[PDB]
Protein backbone atom coordinates (compact mmCIF):
# COMPACT_ATOMS: atom_id res chain seq x y z
CA UNK A 1 0.00 0.00 0.00
CA UNK A 2 1.07 3.39 -0.39
CA UNK A 3 1.68 5.42 3.02
CA UNK A 4 -0.71 8.59 2.37
CA UNK A 5 -0.46 11.53 4.83
CA UNK A 6 -3.87 11.82 7.15
CA UNK A 7 -5.16 14.67 5.71
CA UNK A 8 -6.26 16.21 8.79
CA UNK A 9 -5.68 19.52 7.40
CA UNK A 10 -6.86 22.24 4.45
CA UNK A 11 -4.08 24.18 2.48
CA UNK A 12 -5.77 24.15 -0.91
CA UNK A 13 -8.24 25.68 0.89
CA UNK A 14 -11.83 24.82 0.13
CA UNK A 15 -11.88 28.65 -0.89
CA UNK A 16 -13.34 27.76 -4.08
CA UNK A 17 -16.41 26.05 -2.87
CA UNK A 18 -16.36 28.96 0.22
CA UNK A 19 -16.50 32.25 -1.46
CA UNK A 20 -18.98 30.66 -4.43
CA UNK A 21 -21.39 30.57 -1.55
CA UNK A 22 -23.28 34.02 -1.09
CA UNK A 23 -24.37 34.30 2.45
CA UNK A 24 -27.84 34.57 4.07
CA UNK A 25 -29.51 38.36 5.48
CA UNK A 26 -31.69 36.54 8.58
CA UNK A 27 -30.49 39.40 11.21
CA UNK A 28 -34.16 40.31 12.22
CA UNK A 29 -36.55 36.93 10.82
CA UNK A 30 -39.17 39.64 9.47
CA UNK A 31 -36.40 40.90 7.47
CA UNK A 32 -35.00 43.82 9.02
CA UNK A 33 -38.04 45.55 9.30
CA UNK A 34 -40.11 46.84 12.42
CA UNK A 35 -43.27 46.03 11.22
CA UNK A 36 -45.55 48.32 12.90
CA UNK A 37 -48.49 50.46 12.06
CA UNK A 38 -48.17 53.10 14.88
CA UNK A 39 -44.31 54.67 13.72
CA UNK A 40 -45.54 55.83 10.52
CA UNK A 41 -46.64 59.03 12.20
CA UNK A 42 -45.25 60.50 8.91
CA UNK A 43 -47.10 59.87 5.18
CA UNK A 44 -45.64 60.89 1.90
CA UNK A 45 -49.13 60.28 -0.10
CA UNK A 46 -49.86 63.74 1.58
CA UNK A 47 -49.45 66.44 -1.00
CA UNK A 48 -46.56 66.04 -2.36
CA UNK B 1 -44.46 69.52 18.43
CA UNK B 2 -41.68 70.71 20.73
CA UNK B 3 -44.28 72.30 22.76
CA UNK B 4 -47.81 71.09 22.78
CA UNK B 5 -50.67 72.05 25.16
CA UNK B 6 -51.32 70.73 28.44
CA UNK B 7 -55.00 71.52 29.36
CA UNK B 8 -56.02 72.79 32.89
CA UNK B 9 -59.27 72.71 35.39
CA UNK B 10 -59.44 76.05 35.42
CA UNK B 11 -58.69 79.04 32.87
CA UNK B 12 -57.35 76.01 30.77
CA UNK B 13 -55.43 76.24 27.72
CA UNK B 14 -52.61 78.22 29.31
CA UNK B 15 -49.41 75.93 30.48
CA UNK B 16 -46.82 73.96 27.87
CA UNK B 17 -44.17 71.41 28.38
CA UNK B 18 -41.00 72.23 26.30
CA UNK B 19 -39.80 68.97 25.14
CA UNK B 20 -36.65 70.30 24.20
CA UNK B 21 -35.60 69.47 28.07
CA UNK B 22 -36.41 66.18 29.31
CA UNK B 23 -38.20 65.99 32.68
CA UNK B 24 -39.09 62.56 34.38
CA UNK B 25 -42.17 60.91 33.34
CA UNK B 26 -43.93 60.46 36.88
CA UNK B 27 -44.23 64.31 37.73
CA UNK B 28 -46.03 64.75 33.87
CA UNK B 29 -48.33 62.26 34.83
CA UNK B 30 -48.95 64.08 38.17
CA UNK B 31 -49.07 67.62 36.35
CA UNK B 32 -51.48 66.11 34.07
CA UNK B 33 -53.96 64.06 36.95
CA UNK B 34 -54.27 67.45 38.82
CA UNK B 35 -55.71 68.96 36.16
CA UNK B 36 -57.93 65.77 35.43
CA UNK B 37 -56.84 66.31 31.55
CA UNK B 38 -58.30 64.39 28.73
CA UNK B 39 -56.88 61.13 28.03
CA UNK B 40 -55.69 62.43 24.21
CA UNK B 41 -53.07 64.43 25.78
CA UNK B 42 -51.55 61.00 27.32
CA UNK B 43 -50.76 59.59 23.84
CA UNK B 44 -49.84 63.00 22.57
CA UNK B 45 -47.09 63.41 24.81
CA UNK B 46 -46.31 59.78 24.30
CA UNK B 47 -46.03 60.30 20.76
CA UNK B 48 -44.00 63.80 21.85
CA UNK B 49 -41.51 60.94 24.19
CA UNK B 50 -41.09 58.85 20.82
CA UNK B 51 -39.85 61.53 18.58
CA UNK B 52 -37.83 62.52 21.09
CA UNK B 53 -36.30 59.36 20.90
CA UNK B 54 -37.73 57.01 23.68
CA UNK B 55 -38.48 53.85 24.16
CA UNK B 56 -38.97 52.99 27.03
CA UNK B 57 -40.24 55.99 29.34
CA UNK B 58 -42.18 56.45 26.73
CA UNK B 59 -43.85 52.70 27.10
CA UNK B 60 -44.12 53.50 31.05
CA UNK B 61 -45.32 56.60 31.60
CA UNK B 62 -48.29 55.42 29.71
CA UNK B 63 -48.66 52.24 32.27
CA UNK B 64 -49.24 55.29 34.42
CA UNK B 65 -52.20 56.25 32.03
CA UNK B 66 -53.60 52.82 31.91
CA UNK B 67 -55.37 53.65 35.55
CA UNK B 68 -57.23 56.56 33.61
CA UNK B 69 -59.84 55.16 31.27
CA UNK B 70 -62.61 57.26 32.13
CA UNK B 71 -61.40 59.64 34.89
CA UNK B 72 -63.24 62.45 33.73
CA UNK B 73 -63.53 61.57 30.55
CA UNK B 74 -67.55 61.84 29.43
CA UNK B 75 -66.87 58.32 27.30
CA UNK B 76 -63.03 58.54 26.41
CA UNK B 77 -62.68 54.38 26.78
CA UNK B 78 -62.17 54.84 23.41
CA UNK B 79 -58.89 56.91 24.20
CA UNK B 80 -58.12 54.40 26.46
CA UNK B 81 -58.44 51.23 24.09
CA UNK B 82 -55.92 53.45 21.70
CA UNK B 83 -54.15 53.81 24.60
CA UNK B 84 -54.02 50.26 25.79
CA UNK B 85 -53.12 49.08 21.88
CA UNK B 86 -50.01 51.58 21.97
CA UNK B 87 -48.53 49.40 24.57
CA UNK B 88 -49.31 46.29 23.32
CA UNK B 89 -47.56 46.96 20.36
CA UNK B 90 -44.78 48.30 21.98
CA UNK B 91 -44.09 46.18 24.65
CA UNK B 92 -43.90 43.12 22.47
CA UNK B 93 -42.11 46.08 19.71
CA UNK B 94 -39.07 46.49 23.02
CA UNK B 95 -39.14 42.68 23.51
CA UNK B 96 -37.41 42.18 20.22
CA UNK B 97 -34.43 44.59 21.19
CA UNK B 98 -34.50 42.77 24.22
CA UNK B 99 -31.08 43.23 26.13
CA UNK B 100 -28.25 40.54 27.77
CA UNK B 101 -30.70 40.89 31.41
CA UNK B 102 -34.27 40.32 30.81
CA UNK B 103 -36.25 37.84 29.00
CA UNK B 104 -38.39 38.19 26.18
CA UNK B 105 -41.23 37.09 28.01
CA UNK B 106 -40.08 39.73 30.62
CA UNK B 107 -42.20 42.13 28.25
CA UNK B 108 -44.24 39.50 26.42
CA UNK B 109 -46.35 38.68 29.89
CA UNK B 110 -47.29 42.50 30.35
CA UNK B 111 -48.08 43.05 26.44
CA UNK B 112 -50.25 39.33 26.85
CA UNK B 113 -51.93 40.40 29.96
CA UNK B 114 -52.85 44.48 28.83
CA UNK B 115 -53.97 42.59 25.51
CA UNK B 116 -56.78 40.75 27.33
CA UNK B 117 -57.72 44.34 29.26
CA UNK B 118 -57.45 45.52 25.49
CA UNK B 119 -60.26 43.18 23.90
CA UNK B 120 -62.44 43.69 27.14
CA UNK B 121 -64.15 46.98 25.65
CA UNK B 122 -63.32 46.45 21.90
CA UNK B 123 -62.49 43.49 19.11
CA UNK B 124 -60.78 43.07 16.20
CA UNK B 125 -59.32 46.15 15.97
CA UNK B 126 -56.84 47.27 13.02
CA UNK B 127 -53.69 46.72 15.50
CA UNK B 128 -55.32 43.98 18.07
CA UNK B 129 -54.77 41.71 15.59
Given at each position: ?9 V ?7 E??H????L???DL?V ?7 D??R?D?? | ?GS???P?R ?6 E????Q????D???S??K?E?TQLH?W?A ?13 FV ?13 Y ?9 C?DT ?10 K???K????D?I ?9 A????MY?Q?H?
Amino acid sequence: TYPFDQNRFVQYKATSLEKQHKHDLLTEPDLGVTIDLINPDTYRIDPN
Amino acid sequence: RGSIEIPLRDTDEVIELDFDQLPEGDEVISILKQEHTQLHIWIALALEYYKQGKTEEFVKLLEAARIDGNLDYRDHEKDQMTCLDTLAAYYVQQARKEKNKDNKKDLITQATLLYTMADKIIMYDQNHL
